[PDB]
Structures are given as C-alpha cells and as structure tokens.
Design a protein around this ligand. Structure first.
Ligand SMILES: O=C[C@H](O)[C@@H](O)[C@H](O)[C@H](O)CO
Length: 555
C-alpha cells in the first residue's frame, strides 16, 4: 500500500523537456529531469501517453500500444526511462487508454473494411435509422454526433470523443484479452501501474437508447455502464493481481457512491479514482455549452464537494487529490489571483489540497505557479476548442464569440500544455529549437531556476508539504472534519489520528479573514508546520492576510 503514501507528479511529456532539439518534449528530456522531480519529493511519476498516435488528441488516440510515437523516441528510450526511474527509487505509472483507439490503429483499419472482417466487432457498429440518420442522439464530448458514417459498409461507428477515436467493444472477449496482453507487456517490463483514461465509459448500454428531448446529448449513458465494474474486476483478476502495482481511474461521471464501487479494497477493482465533481463547480449543471458555460469560483461549493468526498471515502476506499492536470487550466488563474498574490494563492490552494486524506497529484508546473496563457484563439492547438468553436459559436449560436473566448481563456486545456518553464532564457529553456506551441509570455518571472533560488518560492512550499507528509503519518491516515463551513472566505478543517490533531486554515480570498477555532479546540497547543507568511503558534484566533495558509499540529 505504498500508493497511499505516494505523491504523484504528472508529466505531459510533449511539453516537459526537449532534450533532442526538435521543439518537442521527449523521453530523454524526461530522463534528464528525474533528479528535479525527486528533489521536489514526488516518488511516483505518471506519464501522459507516449504510444504511437497520429496526435488528433495528443497521444490519447493510440495507433500502436507496443511502440512509442517517433517524436518521443524509441522503445529503447522508454525502457531506459523505466530503469532511470527505478534507479532513483521512484515508480512510473503509464496512461492506459482503452475506451477507444485511433482510427489508424491496425484493428480499426481492418474493422472498417467489411462486416465480415475478423476485427469488425472490435468496435461498435450500428445501422442507420430508417431515415438514414444516426442510430441515436448521443453526442461526442468533443462536439457533434457520437456516430460517424462509413459509406463503404453503410453503418455508423461509435465515438464518445473525436471521429478519429473509435470506441472499443468491451462486450467482445477478444478486445478485453487484447487489452490485458497490452497491460502485461508493459508491466513485465517494469511499468508500476496505470492511470486509466475515461475508464468510466468502457461499458455501454448495448441497446443505445436515445435521451429524452437540442440535437446531440451527452449524459448518464456515457458512463457507469451495467458491466463497468464487471470488466474492471476481470482486469484485476487477469492482470492487476499478478503485479505489485498502483491504479488510478479517470472516473468520468463518478459520484461518491460510484467511487466506492471503484475503490473499496474488498471489491478488488482499483486503488483510487479521479473525480470531476470538484472540477464541475464552475459550470452550469446542464447547458448546451457544457464546461464553457462558466460560473464564478464558489468557495462554499468547493468545501461542500471536497468534504463529501473526504467523509465518503474516509474509512473505505481511497481519494485522489488534484486541482491540475493536462485537461484542466491552472487553478490559480481559474479560481484565484495569478498576479500580485500569485505565490500566496498557489500556496493556499496547495495547502488546502495536501492537508487532506488521499494521494496528492502535482501537475508539471503547478509547483512553480505556472499560469494561464494570454495567447490568441488561433494559437490554441486542442481539437476540443476548434470543435466547440464551430458548434457553439458558428452553427448553433449558443455562445457569442466574445463569450466563447472568455471561457477558453479560463478553462482551455492548452493552459496546461504550454511548455514547462525551466529558466528565463529562450523558450524558458524548454527547447533549443522552436517549441510545438509557444511558451507562456510570463516565463521570465515564473520558472524553475528562479524558484530554486527564492527560498520563499512555491517550489520550496510544495517540497515542504511533501516532506511533512512523509514525517507526519496523520497527514496520510487521519480522519477529516470540516470547520466553520459557512465561512465565505476561509477553508478550514481538522485531521485526527491516534490522539494527535492537524488543523488546516486557508483563506481563499484576497481580503483579510478571521479564523476562530471551535470551543473544543480553544485550549489545544499547536506547532505551526507550514505557512505562506511569517508566523506565535496561538491558533484559537487568527487574523488571516490575503490567501494566508496555516497548517498546525497539536502538541
Ligand atoms: O474535456 C476533457 C477530455 O474529454 C478528457 O477527459 C479525455 O480523457 C481525453 O480526450 C482523452 O481521451
């Protein structure tokens, strides 16, 4: 159960470090930066997908599960990355993307040829409706229909995501055996675990029922299918149980109840899952514009959501802790202050997250306070944006252009994909060539070199938070309790374990705030473990400065 005590660093390798000088982040670049990650303190790295792919969705549309995409390097580089990680006492978690493949996968190239092709059923084909339209009104997460017509066989194929990401048919035993062969291949060669991409979708309602009704709908059939957990349970039986490993599911559509199904140790499925519920706090529940129909940051909602998850898996299953990844913007730009108070705010949000129960995940650049980009709309790369622009702005007109741009500047996935900022030199030292996407214009004041020089840096604050987690077992095994829950500025909570208490008090606003400990904690004595300002250790009453974070342990 080393995975309970781990801190995971997520690398998006095409934007981490270009060792070879082609403007593209590569595996040798990752190897060169292992020392830096270890120095931060993470003991597990999860690497976004580096398998062969036409890059329609930047790695998540795989055309070969057993070879690297050329621009990352070869398999000899990957096996070397694996050995270099293990050498440093670290673990490596690869991204398992098996809800769908690339339409350029060998399997799909055969499958599309005819109905009588051996691979036809590796994927999900349906006849049109009598009037020629799609088998149902299901939409793609990336806009338009979830169904694409093949003139050659007169049938549609299913894709929850891009037209170039046909969904696999998990009902087919051949397809599952194929996936397990892929997992076995890599785990035999030292991969310590998997992050499972949209694992919540692998089971379909095989009757493909319409939604009630404007034109295409994404909803409850797109996840949590009737055989989801059956399949995962088989995966565990056939594979995960043969190795000392770690598993984290990207559980799209997951609520607390579903989380227990995934994570309850007794069910022998997965160790932990990512949820979206705390990420969904700043969108309207059901608008045709989805994630792009944005709501202001609501602290109460954040507290309510995260707390439900802390208490829900408090004594059963296990939580993941994250605010950033390659699918999310920079949390400080999204929900806080990324200018004058950038460091305080980054530290605030870190403290809130790291003081909780579960496994923390640090997204590359989170640890130095990277921010959202001011790049123009035409400079974004993500297919999700271009597709949404076309649907929401051009065709349906459910968002003005100005409104669509505001939304992308807050929530566009590309805010997480501009290259990692290493120093203040050309392309922030990411590359000696021309980067695949431009570096954020603020890199000169926000980078690793300046961070490692400044003792007041966000980097050292993260380093210290990781150190404290290894030193104080209460941070890993304590329970959780929300305090002052109605406070519109302060997020405070308590952890308790074996007679010891850990009090976390974080002001997530730009104004002064007042924390007053509940009556029953008034006569506790505290040792301050960390704070983003200079700090008596007298915590019965704290006048909190803008974005001030305090973590204290009872003595
Ligand atoms: O909007 C977020 C994305 O839909 C993401 O969660 C998918 O996992 C990705 O495209 C890989 O398939």
């Amino acid at each position: 159960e080393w995975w309970k005590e781990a801190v995971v660093y997520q690398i998006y390798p095409r934007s981490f470090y270009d060792a070879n000088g082609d403007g593209f982040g590569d595996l040798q670049g990752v190897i060169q930066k292992l020392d830096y990650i270890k120095n931060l303190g993470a003991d597990v790295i999860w690497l976004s997908p580096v398998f062969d792919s036409p890059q329609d969705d930047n790695g998540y549309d795989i055309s070969d599960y057993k070879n690297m995409y050329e621009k990352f390097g070869t398999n000899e580089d990957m096996f070397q990355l694996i050995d270099e990680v293990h050498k440093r006492g670290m673990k490596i978690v690869m991204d398992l993307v098996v809800n769908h493949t690339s339409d350029e996968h060998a399997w799909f190239a055969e499958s599309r040829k005819s109905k009588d092709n051996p691979y036809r059923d590796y994927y999900l084909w349906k006849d049109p409706k009598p009037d020629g339209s799609e088998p149902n009104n299901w939409g793609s997460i990336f806009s338009g229909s979830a169904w694409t017509y093949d003139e050659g066989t007169g049938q549609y194929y299913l894709h929850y995501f891009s037209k170039k990401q046909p969904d696999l048919n998990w009902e087919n035993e051949a397809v599952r055996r194929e996936v397990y062969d892929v997992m076995r291949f890599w785990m035999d060669r030292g991969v310590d675990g998997w992050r499972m991409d949209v694992i919540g979708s692998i089971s379909k309602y095989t009757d493909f029922p319409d939604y009630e009704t404007r034109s295409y709908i994404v909803g409850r059939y797109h996840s949590n299918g009737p055989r989801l957990h059956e399949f995962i349970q088989e995966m565990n039986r056939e594979v995960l149980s043969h190795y000392d490993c770690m598993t984290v599911g990207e559980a799209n559509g997951s609520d607390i109840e579903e989380a227990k199904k995934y994570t309850d140790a007794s069910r022998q499925e997965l160790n932990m899952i990512f949820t979206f519920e705390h990420m969904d706090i700043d969108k309207e529940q059901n608008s045709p514009n989805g994630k792009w129909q944005i709501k202001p940051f609501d602290l109460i909602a954040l507290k309510k959501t995260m707390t439900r998850w802390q208490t829900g898996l408090m004594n059963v299953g296990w939580n993941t802790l994250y605010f950033e990844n390659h699918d999310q913007p920079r949390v400080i730009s999204r929900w806080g202050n990324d200018r004058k108070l950038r460091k305080e705010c980054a530290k605030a949000f870190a403290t809130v997250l790291h003081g909780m129960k579960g496994t923390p995940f640090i997204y590359q650049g989170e640890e130095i306070g990277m921010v959202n980009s001011d790049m123009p709309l035409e400079m974004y790369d993500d297919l999700e944006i271009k597709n949404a622009y076309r649907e929401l702005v051009v065709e349906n007109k459910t968002m003005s252009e100005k409104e669509f741009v505001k939304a992308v500047m807050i929530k566009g996935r590309d805010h997480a994909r501009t290259p990692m900022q290493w120093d203040a030199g050309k392309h922030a030292g990411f590359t000696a060539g021309d980067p695949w996407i431009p570096v954020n214009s603020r890199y000169q004041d926000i980078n690793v070199k300046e961070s490692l020089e400044d003792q007041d840096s966000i980097f050292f604050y993260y380093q210290k938070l990781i150190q404290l987690r290894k030193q104080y077992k209460i941070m890993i095994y304590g329970d959780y309790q929300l305090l002052q829950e109605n406070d519109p500025q302060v997020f405070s909570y308590l952890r308790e374990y074996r007679g010891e208490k850990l009090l976390v008090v974080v002001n997530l606003s730009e104004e002064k705030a007042l924390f007053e400990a509940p009556p029953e904690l008034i006569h506790e004595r505290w040792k301050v473990l960390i704070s983003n300002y200079p700090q008596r250790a007298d915590l019965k009453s704290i006048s909190l400065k803008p974005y001030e974070a305090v973590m204290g342990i009872s003595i």
